[PDB]
Design an enzyme around this catalytic site. Structure first.
Site, PDB file in Angstrom:
ATOM      1  CB  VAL A  32      -2.619  -6.758  -6.077  1.00 28.53           C
ATOM      2  CG1 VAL A  32      -3.202  -8.155  -5.951  1.00 28.53           C
ATOM      3  CG2 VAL A  32      -1.096  -6.827  -6.019  1.00 28.53           C
ATOM      4  N   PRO A  83       1.321  -7.947 -10.846  1.00 30.17           N
ATOM      5  CG  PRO A  83       1.899  -8.345 -13.110  1.00 30.17           C
ATOM      6  CD  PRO A  83       1.918  -8.981 -11.730  1.00 30.17           C
ATOM      7  CG  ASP A 108       0.351  -5.733   9.677  1.00 26.51           C
ATOM      8  OD1 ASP A 108       1.149  -5.770  10.633  1.00 26.51           O
ATOM      9  OD2 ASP A 108       0.486  -5.009   8.663  1.00 26.51           O
ATOM     10  CG  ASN A 127       9.447   0.081   3.677  1.00 30.19           C
ATOM     11  OD1 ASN A 127       8.734   0.956   3.180  1.00 30.19           O
ATOM     12  ND2 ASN A 127       8.972  -0.742   4.606  1.00 30.19           N
ATOM     13  CB  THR A 141      -5.652  19.830  -6.021  1.00 31.96           C
ATOM     14  OG1 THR A 141      -5.937  21.136  -5.523  1.00 31.96           O
ATOM     15  CG2 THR A 141      -6.970  19.204  -6.418  1.00 31.96           C
ATOM     16  CG  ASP A 154      -0.944  -0.597  -9.824  1.00 32.64           C
ATOM     17  OD1 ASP A 154      -1.150  -0.577 -11.054  1.00 32.64           O
ATOM     18  OD2 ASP A 154      -0.647  -1.616  -9.189  1.00 32.64           O
ATOM     19  CG  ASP A 206       0.373  17.646  -7.566  1.00 30.83           C
ATOM     20  OD1 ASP A 206       0.583  18.486  -8.476  1.00 30.83           O
ATOM     21  OD2 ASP A 206      -0.700  17.613  -6.892  1.00 30.83           O
ATOM     22  CG  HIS A 234       3.567  -3.271  11.126  1.00 29.81           C
ATOM     23  ND1 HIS A 234       2.919  -3.966  10.133  1.00 29.81           N
ATOM     24  CD2 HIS A 234       4.417  -2.427  10.505  1.00 29.81           C
ATOM     25  CE1 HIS A 234       3.337  -3.541   8.961  1.00 29.81           C
ATOM     26  NE2 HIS A 234       4.256  -2.590   9.159  1.00 29.81           N
TER      27      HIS A 234
HETATM   28 NA    NA Z   1      -1.050  -3.400 -10.557  1.00 31.99          NA
HETATM   29 NA    NA Z   2      -1.399  19.678  -7.662  1.00 33.73          NA
END
Ligand code: NA
Ligand code: NA
Length: 279
Positions: free
Chosen positions: A177, A175, A39, A161, A16, A200, A260, A69
Site C-alpha cells: 500500500v 509494503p 474513519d 504519529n 516545486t 513511500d 526538498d 476526525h
Molecule cells: Na509501499
Molecule cells: Na524544490
C-alpha cells in the site's frame, strides 16, 4: 484552474518550492473517481461536500461522525475549499467510534467491505481508500490492507504519529500500500511523523485547515492529515488517466519533489507529493 489563499498543503502539492498561497489544479478535479474514507464517519450534510459525500456503512449504533476526525480527512480529499480533488465522490465507512478508537476486527471488516462495495458503485476513473488510523503491528491488519489494494483500490495509510520506524505499526508496515509521512509548511518532517524504509511518500500534515462537525472547520496536525492529501492526489491523477489504482503510489513517488525535505533520517525517502500541473 487556481484557488487563491488556499490552505498551505493544497498550495504545497502544486508547487516545486514552499511558501506559495495558490493551488494550481486541472478543472477535471477528480470527477468520475471514488474515495472511501475509513474513519469516524463523515458529516455528509456539510455544505463543503456539495452533496458529493454519503455514508455507506457503520459498525456502530449511528452512521453520524460524533468525533470530527473522519470529516476532517474527507475534507482534505474532496471538499470545495479544503480538498485536493474537488469533484470526487466521497463514501464514508465508520470503523472508529466517536472517541477515535476501534478494534482491529472492525477495521479488517471495513477494508473487506470496501473491496466488495466498490463493485456496486459508478466510479469509471477508479477507487481510492484513505485510512488515517493504525496501531501496533498485526499481520491481519496488514494482510487486509493488501487484499484491498490487490482488489483494485489505491490504498493510502498513515505512517503513524510516534516519531518512530513505521515498521512496528499496521497497516503502515504493509509494503504493497502507499504509506504517507507528514511534512510542515517549511519542508521539515513533522516532529511526530513516523519514518523508515516502508514509507513511500510525504504529504502536508502540520496545521491543516479542513472541515469539522457542526458545519465548522479547524486546524489539526498528524499523518492522518497527510494521508488524504495523497488519496486525493491519486483520485485526481486517476481522473486525468496518468496512472491506475495498481501503480498510483509508484507514479506519485516518480513525479514527486525530490530532496526538498529536512530532518529525514538516512534510509527514508525524501519525496513530497506533487501534482505537476502546467496551465
Ligand atoms: Na509501499
Ligand atoms: Na524544490
Amino acid at each position: 484552474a487556481a484557488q487563491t489563499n488556499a490552505p498551505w498543503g493544497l498550495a504545497r502539492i502544486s508547487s516545486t518550492s514552499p511558501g506559495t498561497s495558490t493551488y494550481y489544479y486541472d478543472e477535471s478535479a477528480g470527477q468520475g473517481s471514488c474515495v472511501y474514507v475509513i474513519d469516524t464517519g463523515i458529516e455528509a450534510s456539510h455544505p463543503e461536500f456539495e452533496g458529493r459525500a454519503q455514508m455507506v456503512k457503520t459498525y456502530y449504533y449511528s452512521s453520524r461522525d460524533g468525533n470530527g476526525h473522519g470529516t476532517h480527512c474527507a475534507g482534505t480529499v474532496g471538499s470545495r475549499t479544503y480538498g485536493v480533488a474537488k469533484k470526487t465522490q466521497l463514501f464514508g465507512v465508520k470503523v472508529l467510534d466517536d472517541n477515535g478508537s476501534g478494534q482491529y476486527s472492525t477495521i479488517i471488516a471495513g477494508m473487506d467491505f470496501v473491496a466488495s462495495d466498490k463493485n456496486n458503485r459508478n466510479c469509471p476513473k477508479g477507487v481510492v481508500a484513505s485510512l488515517s488510523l493504525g496501531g501496533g503491528y498485526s499481520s491481519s491488519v496488514n494482510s487486509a490492507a493488501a487484499r484491498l489494494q490487490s482488489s483494485g483500490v489505491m490504498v493510502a495509510v498513515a505512517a503513524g504519529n510516534n516519531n518512530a520506524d513505521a515498521r512496528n505499526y499496521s497497516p503502515a508496515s504493509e509494503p504493497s500500500v502507499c504509506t504517507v509521512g507528514a511534512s510542515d509548511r517549511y519542508d521539515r518532517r513533522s516532529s511526530f511523523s513516523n519514518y523508515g524504509s516502508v514509507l513511500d511518500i510525504f504529504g502536508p500534515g502540520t496545521d491543516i485547515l479542513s472541515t469539522w462537525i457542526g458545519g465548522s472547520t479547524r486546524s489539526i496536525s498528524g499523518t492522518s492529515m497527510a494521508t488524504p492529501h495523497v488519496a486525493g492526489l491519486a483520485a485526481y491523477l486517476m481522473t486525468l488517466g496518468k496512472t491506475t489504482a495498481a501503480s498510483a503510489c509508484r507514479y506519485i513517488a516518480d513525479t514527486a519533489n525530490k530532496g526538498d525535505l529536512s530532518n529525514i533520517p538516512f534510509g527514508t525517502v525524501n519525496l513530497l507529493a506533487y501534482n505537476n500541473y502546467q496551465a
